[PDB]
């Protein structure tokens, strides 16, 4: 459950085991509710303008023992589900959204369970829709360019 | 088409102004009739913009070591020329509190670059906050 930063936002990386019973279903676990709740309470502590996008990923594991037809479908539902819980716990739907990246964005080699839980992680990306820099470039455009 | 273009980068807009059009002789930092109106032109935009914008007037120079004048090395010259530019805008409107100057085919190296930006720190604060309630 590492936290990573990039120039455009903060990323909260959570493996499959911390949210679901397995990496190939949208079915959640026991400790789920308490952990998501913790993250929900934290989110609640951010500016009311910060956007929170819940992105889901999957390994490249063949879909058999499950019901889904794409790793995109699988990712969408898991992300959807985590987005719903965040809400059930108080986060504002207006600030939320969910996503799916399928299987083509791994974190590492799917050689060891641990790493495979990473590739089926949920990612909570935080950010905003800053447009000043763009607001400025535009103004200057019309006047000078 | 009377001045220089607007360049844009992820962190702000750039307005490159060749000194060979701003300043009398390359070895100098004296403004002029041709450049005043355009510095006045620029000054109005800075005024129209949301005061949370800042303006850094930054100076650039070639290699030509022209020591014949008072100025010593390249830095002094930029510093000097970036300052003169950053001052005309003050007498033309732009409130002294948004202006900041600095010093860094050669006609494409001798300019006074106007950098439009802000100090947007929201992503920072977001990470500030998340870093706490998580990691060991």
Swiss-Prot record, chain A:
A GO term from the CC aspect: bacterial-type flagellum stator complex
All residue ranges annotated as the OmpA-like domain in the record: 7-130
Subcellular location: Cell inner membrane
Stretches assigned to the Periplasmic side: 1-145
Lineage top rank: taxon: Bacteria
Bilayer topology term: Single-pass type II membrane protein
Subunit (UniProt): Each stator complex is composed of 4 MotA and 2 MotB subunits. 2 A subunits and 1 B subunit are thought to form a single ion channel, so that each stator complex contains two channels.
Protein name: Motility protein B
Source organism of the structure: Helicobacter pylori (strain ATCC 700392 / 26695)
Lineage per the UniProt record: Bacteria, Pseudomonadati, Campylobacterota, Epsilonproteobacteria, Campylobacterales
């Amino acid at each position: 459950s590492v936290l990573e930063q990039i120039d455009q936002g903060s990323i909260l990386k959570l493996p499959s085991n911390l949210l679901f019973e397995n990496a190939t279903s949208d079915a959640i676990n026991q400790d789920m509710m308490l952990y998501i709740e913790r993250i929900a309470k934290i989110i609640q502590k951010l500016p009311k303008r910060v956007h929170i996008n819940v992105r889901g990923f999957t390994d490249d594991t063949p879909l058999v023992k499950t019901r889904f037809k794409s790793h995109y479908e699988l990712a969408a539902n898991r992300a959807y589900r985590v987005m719903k819980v965040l809400i059930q716990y108080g986060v504002n739907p207006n600030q939320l959204s969910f996503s799916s990246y399928g299987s083509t964005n791994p974190i590492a080699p799917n050689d060891s369970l641990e790493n495979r839980m990473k590739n089926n992680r949920v990612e909570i990306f935080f950010s905003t829709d800053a447009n000043d820099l763009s607001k400025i470039h535009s103004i200057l455009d019309n006047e000078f360019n």
